[PDB]
Write an enzyme that holds these catalytic residues in place. Structure first.
Site, PDB file in Angstrom:
ATOM      1  N   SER A 146      19.646   3.452 -18.045  1.00 42.29           N
ATOM      2  CA  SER A 146      20.196   2.324 -17.208  1.00 42.29           C
ATOM      3  C   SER A 146      19.989   2.606 -15.672  1.00 42.29           C
ATOM      4  CB  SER A 146      21.665   2.064 -17.547  1.00 42.29           C
ATOM      5  OG  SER A 146      22.160   0.900 -16.872  1.00 42.29           O
ATOM      6  N   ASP A 201      17.617  -5.736 -24.984  1.00 43.79           N
ATOM      7  CA  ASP A 201      18.371  -5.071 -23.946  1.00 43.79           C
ATOM      8  C   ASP A 201      18.263  -5.902 -22.639  1.00 43.79           C
ATOM      9  OD1 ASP A 201      19.630  -3.417 -22.174  1.00 43.79           O
ATOM     10  OD2 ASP A 201      18.509  -1.622 -22.580  1.00 43.79           O
ATOM     11  N   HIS A 258      21.744  -2.555 -25.165  1.00 44.33           N
ATOM     12  CA  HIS A 258      21.549  -1.567 -24.054  1.00 44.33           C
ATOM     13  C   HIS A 258      22.131  -0.219 -24.352  1.00 44.33           C
ATOM     14  CE1 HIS A 258      21.013  -0.137 -20.059  1.00 44.33           C
ATOM     15  NE2 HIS A 258      22.292  -0.166 -19.762  1.00 44.33           N
TER      16      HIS A 258
END
Lengths: 269, 269
Positions: A146, A201, A258
């Site tokens: 991320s 995602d 995610h």
């Protein structure tokens, strides 16, 4: 489709990224064995792996993570954590491109993330170079999930070309800027960047191509669902800048996707 | 070391228990298909399952859950959600008994799971009597994870005796009463109890055998680790009121093992 050997590395760096979030690595000492709560990094646990330096909120952007030594795998791994609270961090994302030229000509890189590494570059570049010296036989890898991912990619393309290769493994990373940049990250040597993505995602959907952003090549796209185990026969190489049938498929996106890269990631049981 | 058919039922009810925390399930118009967020309950999504009565926070114990009509599996499922923070519910866990001679003479129970149930007992007994009426041949099944498990169990023991079997599947349930309650729950008629535990899960070890609490038998122990897929081979039947050699092992407990029952449960992605 992807080799057993690439699959293991992908898995291992996913765990190194997840370890950035879970268990005793948010702040800490040096020399410590790396361990994670809730089985979040077993392959790292299984390796003779130890902390070299641990960081937090470094500089202007809040940079958190660690520098590890893996004697089993022969590595020096810099891992950047992502945000403490992802859904917040998601809606707030400025679609803004600051020219990258120092890193490459004609390129364009996201002001927030682009500005974020510079903030800290010298204090960690140093700490890597030091380790490089001690184990110059060891592969330098920077990884992250991320926000952690983006950092890694930026730390990488940046600090490359001082004699030591820098691999990057990103899991669910967002675009950091433009088609020139993209083309850069794609052909830049001294480190093979591995941009891993999952299904839909939301993170690597943003920012949009509608905003002049683009993603480097290739992309590694996990098509297995959320909570589903990953096998090397579920990962597809989407070679070609912004080719479709990838995290860039036309359709609608999601956050639980995610958090699932090989195992649970960016959260902690 | 359990059968396949038994495994699927374990798995479906784990999903059904999961759904009580996750999805758009918390309150929605009756008859709407049951769904969850973050791949929490795909086998339930596969079925023709709708809500019958939706509730949350009702009861004097903020009791939360749903009644569910499953046309595909031919079931009527009553599902109880656990605490929103299993920590602030492990921490705050009061272990004081109460008389429960309504259920079984001599039996004494946790004043908490008893009282929250007692309060919703009439109203929910009624709603199951309507679906049993509506579907006489369907299987009534009471399920839950964590607190949910416990409530479900205290429901089963209580509502058994109306002319329909009530089966109970709890996941990572706490111990619920003294030695009298146990045996009642080990050999009672009119429905089978399937008490599922995973590894070194914490809640099933509470309250202690030394606050006047004991376990119903049998136990179906899940030996696979946290975030590890479950096979029929990773479940082992543990026979005996308060037996050891399953979860009831003198070792150190683990909150995250509580959050993995066949899949993610007790939290939402």
């Amino acid at each position: 489709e992807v080799s057993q050997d690439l699959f293991n590395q992908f898995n291992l760096f996913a765990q190194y990224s997840a370890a950035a979030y879970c268990g005793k690595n948010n702040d800490a000492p040096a020399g410590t064995n790396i361990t994670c709560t809730g089985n979040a990094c077993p392959e790292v646990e299984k390796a003779d792996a130890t902390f070299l330096y641990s960081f937090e909120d470094s500089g202007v952007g809040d940079v958190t993570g660690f520098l590890a030594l893996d004697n089993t795998n022969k590595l020096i791994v810099l891992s950047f954590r992502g945000s403490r609270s992802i859904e917040n961090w998601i809606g707030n994302l400025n679609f803004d491109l600051k020219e990258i030229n120092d890193i490459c000509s004609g390129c364009r890189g996201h002001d927030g993330f682009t500005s974020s590494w510079r903030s800290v570059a010298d204090t960690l570049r140093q700490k890597v170079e030091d380790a490089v010296r001690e184990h110059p036989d060891y592969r330098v890898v920077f990884t992250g999930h991320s926000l952690g991912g983006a950092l890694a990619t930026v730390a990488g393309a940046d600090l490359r070309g001082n004699g030591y290769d820098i691999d990057v493994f990103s899991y669910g990373a967002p675009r950091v800027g433009n088609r020139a940049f993209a083309e850069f990250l794609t052909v830049q040597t001294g480190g093979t960047l591995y941009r891993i993505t999952h299904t839909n995602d939301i993170v690597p959907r943003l920012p949009p191509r509608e905003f002049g952003y683009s993603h480097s090549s290739p992309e590694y796209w996990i098509k297995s669902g959320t909570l589903v185990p990953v096998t090397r026969n579920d990962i597809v190489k989407i070679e070609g800048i912004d080719a479709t049938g990838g995290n860039n498929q036309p359709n609608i996106p999601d956050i639980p996707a995610h958090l699932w890269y090989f195992g649970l990631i960016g959260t902690c049981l």
